[PDB]
Amino acid sequence: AKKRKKKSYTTPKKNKHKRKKVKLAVLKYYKVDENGKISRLRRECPSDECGAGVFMASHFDRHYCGKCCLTYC
Amino acid sequence: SSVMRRNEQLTLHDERFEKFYEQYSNRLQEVLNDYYKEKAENCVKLNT
Amino acid sequence: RTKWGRRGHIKEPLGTHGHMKCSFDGKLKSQDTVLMNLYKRVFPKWTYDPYVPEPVPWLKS
Amino acid sequence: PRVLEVYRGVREVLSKYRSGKLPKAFKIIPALSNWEQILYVTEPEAWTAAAMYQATRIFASNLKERMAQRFYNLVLLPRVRDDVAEYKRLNFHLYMALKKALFKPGAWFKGILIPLCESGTCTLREAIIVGSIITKCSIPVLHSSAAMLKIAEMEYSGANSIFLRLLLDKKYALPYRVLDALVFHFLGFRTEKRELPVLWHQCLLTLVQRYKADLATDQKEALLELLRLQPHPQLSPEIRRELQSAVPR
RNA sequence: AGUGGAGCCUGCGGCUUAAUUUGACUCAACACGGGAAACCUCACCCGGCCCGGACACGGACAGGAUUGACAGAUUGAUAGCUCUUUCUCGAUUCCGUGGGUGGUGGUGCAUGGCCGUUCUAGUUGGUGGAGCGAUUUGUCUGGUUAAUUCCGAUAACGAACGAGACUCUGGCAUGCUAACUAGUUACGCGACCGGUCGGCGUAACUUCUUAGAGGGACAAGUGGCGUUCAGCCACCCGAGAUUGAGCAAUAACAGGUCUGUGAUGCCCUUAGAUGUCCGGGGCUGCACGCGCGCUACACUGACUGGCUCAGCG
Ligand SMILES: [Zn+2]
């Protein structure tokens, strides 16, 4: 059968938006003392299922958990 | 379970088959009020 | 003209982008390719010099 | 009460859905205690195709593999079978939903794949459409082999061997017990008088094309007995070729 | 009775426009796609986000690959498909380069099932006979019929297929079977002036209404014409003497149709065989032709008030 030519044309899709890689975010949660005491910087969520381990985000005014969608003042 | 098997060399993983075949409010009221809040803000009819 | 042998000519242009309605003699296959031939007269370059360098003995690579 | 009026409202939203931000009441369905009562008010059978994709997108992310599985089994999988029977090809959003359903492979296999082949009524067209999504999405080795073992032990249909081939097409390193089930699967047709389709031979081809290195002499010669009883003019010499040029371990 | 003349409406040309999506052009082109298009329908145009396989190679990841995410700020849009928030989610991998071996592909052929188009009266064997054979006889002098129909003549005799036949339907019943979702009559009570009442309450059973069975029309009878036969015409009685449909399941199609199978032949797959969605437009645009319609052009009318009757649904 009569073959199609296939055309060129170059349009760059190389530039595409990717969210920023935050490196080593575990140290921001806890401040360890020289003796060995653990101090938590962020509020821990007291929800139904996501307790004891899951922290809340520090907004400019409020606190926000990232699993259950709990919001404060 | 079959007859003719693996015979020779290496056993990296043991495999877990015994899970697949052997298988077979305050916050709600907040969202409810948020729904009506939104369904009011879609048609304003008031503000200046 | 057309790869599968149909002879046509353009009718209306439609889009602001290059789209055109085209009449043909028969019905085109979907597997087809439409193509027009453009011609211009071409004359050779004036690169005449009587001098030509002496070649070295020829050999096979 | 009043909650019944909220979800009867979103029932008329999801029936006419196409795009945009969904109502927040819909996004918190797997967080509820009595979620199956709520879902019946929203009427999943009356939903638009576009809504179905974002419905699946909710259930796959909100954890609970057991809650995720029962959504696919009751809502998603019947709708897939409803449209392949009707339109003959699948809707785009409905297809995109199935790729999103593979974010929880456990709930995927136990909810979509295994229940489909166990029904027996699964057609060839149904199998290829869903089976192509297996080829597209990478699946964990443990879960990949676990689904492969069930299908090998399962009752034979034309639609069944399509899935089995496509799982071997992924070309992961296999558990050794799975290989024993696969050999026993194919050797189950050694005495069968039934005419076997071309898709069956291709599945036997892909098994020998990749996993010729992990076949012992006992089962290796049992396969040569199989091709001698159930032959093919085109494919059987190729499997015979692949067995004869095989290095074990 | 009109249309063609008038206004308007719509269809097709043509003309515009970014787009005014569209096959068919003397029947089978012409209110065909049930197509009355604000959205959808929509195929068309102007815009804007979004991602677009497997495979091999080279990079990142457990010192998170990636998913999901409350509120706020953005452009024509309540874009977690951007930033403050980075909080969770534990491999469900994604970042660059490519080379053929790309498949929710496209089309072409072999084959497996099922449609439509032209007329509406033929079509086609089998066996026998005639001819070297193409072929012919059957399939015909004559009459007759819508007709290779029929009578009948006969080197033909028999068939199959369709039309015909079959079935329904309609016309008819003061005969029959019934009808608390049909109706009448009579009888009570009431209202009104011996009568009128779609006012209300059960003894009359089918006239009306319904829905069934059984009848009933068969060229039955008479007259004329006819090889005195096949048939044709007229007429009495009759509800009906010539009801209409489907079946009836033809001929030609090189028009084919459809998610059937062929490790089917090719062509295409960051040139997505219409990618999904988002917002706004267009299909109506108008000098003109060619056409189907509606309203009219009044006095057999218009207006105004009064009066009284359906059926398909
Ligand atoms: Zn949360």
Side-chain angles (χ1 to χ4, degrees), chain A residues 2-4 6 10-11 13 17 22 28 31 39 41 43-44 52 54-55 58-59 62-63 67-68 70-72:
Chain A
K2 326 285 158 188
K3 211 168 175 186
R4 208 173 77 197
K6 189 166 197 165
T10 358
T11 317
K13 207 198 166 189
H17 231 251
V22 185
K28 211 84 183 75
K31 192 183 180 180
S39 186
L41 269 82
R43 178 86 165 291
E44 163 89 37
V54 185
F55 278 130
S58 187
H59 280 294
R62 68 204 183 277
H63 297 283
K67 198 181 266 178
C68 62
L70 192 78
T71 329
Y72 279 126

Side-chain angles (χ1 to χ4, degrees), chain A residues 50 64-70:
Chain A
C50 80
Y64 173 74
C65 176
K67 198 181 266 178
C68 62
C69 305
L70 192 78

Side-chain angles (χ1 to χ4, degrees), chain A residues 68-69, chain B residues 25-38, chain D residues 6-7 23-28:
Chain A
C68 62
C69 305
Chain B
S25 298
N26 186 67
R27 269 168 67 255
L28 185 271
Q29 201 62 62
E30 196 274 331
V31 178
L32 254 55
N33 296 341
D34 191 275
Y35 177 79
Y36 281 107
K37 161 258 158 181
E38 212 284 330
Chain D
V6 178
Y7 287 104
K24 211 167 154 192
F26 181 80
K27 289 186 275 172
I28 54 147

Side-chain angles (χ1 to χ4, degrees), chain C residues 33-53 55-58:
Chain C
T33 324
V34 186
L35 37 92
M36 62 156 66
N37 311 298
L38 300 177
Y39 303 101
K40 83 177 277 187
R41 199 177 163 177
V42 69
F43 317 91
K45 286 262 202 295
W46 191 289
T47 53
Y48 178 74
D49 60 320
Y51 168 73
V52 59
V56 295
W58 195 89

